[PDB]
Amino acid sequence: SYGSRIEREQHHLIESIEKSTQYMAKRRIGALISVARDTGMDDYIETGIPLNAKISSQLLINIFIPNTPLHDGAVIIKGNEIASAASYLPLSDSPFLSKELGTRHRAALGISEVTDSITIVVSEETGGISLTKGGELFRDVSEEELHKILLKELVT
Numbered sequence: 001s002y003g004s005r006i007e008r009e010q011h012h013l014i015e016s017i018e019k020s021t022q023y024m025a026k027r028r029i030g031a032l033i034s035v036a037r038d039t040g041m042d043d044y045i046e047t048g049i050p051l052n053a054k055i056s057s058q059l060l061i062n063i064f065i066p067n068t069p070l071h072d073g074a075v076i077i078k079g080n081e082i083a084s085a086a087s088y089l090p091l092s093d094s095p096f097l098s099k100e101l102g103t104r105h106r107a108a109l110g111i112s113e114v115t116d117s118i119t120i121v122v123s124e125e126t127g128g129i130s131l132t133k134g135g136e137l138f139r140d141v142s143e144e145e146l147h148k149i150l151l152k153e154l155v156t
Contacts, residue, residue: 009055010155011155012055013035013055013154014154016055016057017033017057017120018146018147018150020060020061020064021129022143023057024064025122025127025129027127028124028127029122029124030066030102031060031120032073032074032075032089032104032108032120032121033075033077033119033120034111034118035117035120036076036079036083037117037153039115039116039117044084044087044089044090044111045076045078045083047087047088048074048075048083048085048087049085050084051070051081051083052081055080055082059082060082063075063082070085071086072086074086075087088107089107089108089119090107090111090114091103091110092107092110092113092135097109098139101123101130104121104123104124105121108121108130108137109137111132112134113135116133116134118133118149118150118153119132120146126140128140131146131149
């Protein structure tokens with residue numbers, strides 16, 4: 001299993017993001033998940049706590065539980081692993097980002113301006129799910145909309 005093993009991994013990654021963000025959105029647990037693609041993110045992985053862990057919805061949920069050792073920052077997914085938790089992501093300086101969106105959104109926008117990553121945000125204030133890519137924000141997406149974007153962008 002080579003190319004076909006990859007697709008099973010990518011679809012499991014999508015499902016893992018969908019299940020965990022749905023769980024966290026319902027409970028208004030803030031989350032920040034950046035999926036590396038072609039642009040290396042080892043610099044930002046080094047700022048976090050190394051996990052090098054199998055991807056699962058359960059582990060993603062456990063990471064972001066508030067006031068816990070792994071929650072205070074971003075999860076970065078690299079290849080087929082959860083590489084790090086509590087990672088830094090650079091804050092966008094954009095004045096176009098709505099002032100009602102917090103640091104998670106600004107950090108997701110920031111990494112999206114200097115990498116080709118796909119970053120998913122769960123708002124702890126609204127439960128809304130947002131995505132950043134290439135300096136753009138997809139704000140408060142539906143489950144269907146998130147699904148289509150993750151399929152387009154993570155299944156190659």
